[PDB]
Structures are given as C-alpha cells and as structure tokens.
C-alpha cells in the first residue's frame, strides 16, 4: 500500500486521472 | 518519463493531467 515517491505521485494521479489511469509519457 | 519528472518534486495538476490516459 505504501508509496514510493515523496511527491505522492500515485495518489496524485489517481485523483487527476481516475479510472482513465495514466501513462509514463505526457501527451503535451 | 513521469517517474523521472514528478517523483523527486511535485508536479502541478496541469502537468500531471498531461500524463493521463
């Protein structure tokens, strides 16, 4: 359950993208 | 990618948005 990044990246992406999920490379 | 870019430092919500599917 614990996080890897001091930024709390995974939690932050779960809120920004939701069930879309994310990819490692930005589209813009 | 995102791990190299948004993990040692906080990326903005605009930034994170660009990584979404």
């Amino acid at each position, epitope marked *: 359950n614990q996080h890897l990044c001091g930024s709390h990246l995974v939690e932050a992406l779960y809120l920004v993208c939701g069930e879309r999920g994310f*990819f*490692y*490379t930005p*589209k813009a | *990618g*995102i791990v190299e870019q948004c993990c040692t430092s906080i990326c903005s919500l605009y930034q994170l948005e660009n990584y979404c*599917n």
Partner: antibody
Amino acid sequence: EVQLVESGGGLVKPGGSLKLSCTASGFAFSDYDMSWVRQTPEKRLEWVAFISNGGYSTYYPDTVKGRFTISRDNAENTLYLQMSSLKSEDTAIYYCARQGLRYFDYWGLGTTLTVSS
Amino acid sequence: DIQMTQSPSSLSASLGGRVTITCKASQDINKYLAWYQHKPGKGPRLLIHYTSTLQPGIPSRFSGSGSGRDYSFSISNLEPEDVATYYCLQYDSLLSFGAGTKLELKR
C-alpha cells in the same frame, strides 16, 4: 542529425531467444523515453515495448508481456530488446523510436526478425 | 484500447492533385492524433502531431484537422516523394495506430 540504428535481427526457431540493439546519436539520449515498434507482414504497426528515459518505467502489451524485456544503457547510448519464447507471430521488422512526448518523433531503419522452424 | 479506423486502405492520385485520408477513433481523443509517412525500406517519418501541427521541416502541403473522433489528413500538390504508406496514431489514451493508407500514382 538524430540517428537510430537497430541491429541484431535474424532468423530464430520458435521458442528461441534474440537480443536486438539500437544505437542512438545526435541528441541527449538519457533525456528521452524510448520504444520498440514492429511492422507485421500485413503492414500493421505494433507498439511492442516502452522504457522511460531513466529506465525507471516500462510497459508491454499483453501480446509480448512476460516474453520481452526492454532495457537501456544510457552511458553507451543504446536501447535494447531481449526477446524470448519467440513465436511465429513475432515475425516483423522491429523499429527503434523516440518519444519526447507520447507520439513517436524519430525512427530507425529497422531490423528484421523471422521466427520459423 | 482506442481503435483507429483509417480509410481508405489504398488510394491512387495524380501528380499535383489532392488526397484526403480519414481516421475515426472509437472514443473522443481530444486532438491527440499524429500522422506518419512510411516508405519501403525506410523508417516511419512523423508529419503532424496534435491533429494539425506540422513537425519542423515538413512541407506545408501536408495538413491535418479534426476533433472529437473524426480526423483527416491531406496532401496538397502531390509530389512523387509522397508515394508511401501513411498512418495515424492516437496518443490520448496509451497509443494506437490506424491500419494505414497506401498512396499510389494515377496513370
């Protein structure tokens, strides 16, 4: 003067192994996420493997997940694709491709794989 | 994934004419569509990103357009170098390619 040179293609029996290489020059290779994309005999383009610029992140479609491993040696400006459990459906030209953003912006000339008994 | 439907699969044109290719997405892809030209024996070459933004260097006779799910790519003043296979790519949700349009000469 961005250059990507694939190498290592050849013929392999089903179930065999092969390591493809890709030599980068003309740019800051360690800043770029990199992919392998293949073209099937029916001329479809198939995204095969992804690796982030620092090697932290990785992605594989289900068709090759568990059989392929993408890796990079940034100090040698080389992207790699280790394939194993090769199947005839893997027969294609394999391309090296650069992703500053998510869309590919540079490709190599390709290297050809044939999987056959 | 997102499925790209590309049409037509093959196309014949006359030198100096115009050609138009279509890509329909299975969902909205928010203009995140790229276009590639692929010639035999060479590697693909990026032409357009973000629906209509030309890569630097690419002749202005190339263009694209669209939104939502309906996009189109176009060649004005068809030149002999333009005979090739063209592919769209959506990169809004992961990555997926169109099946390709083979572009041949009329004679």
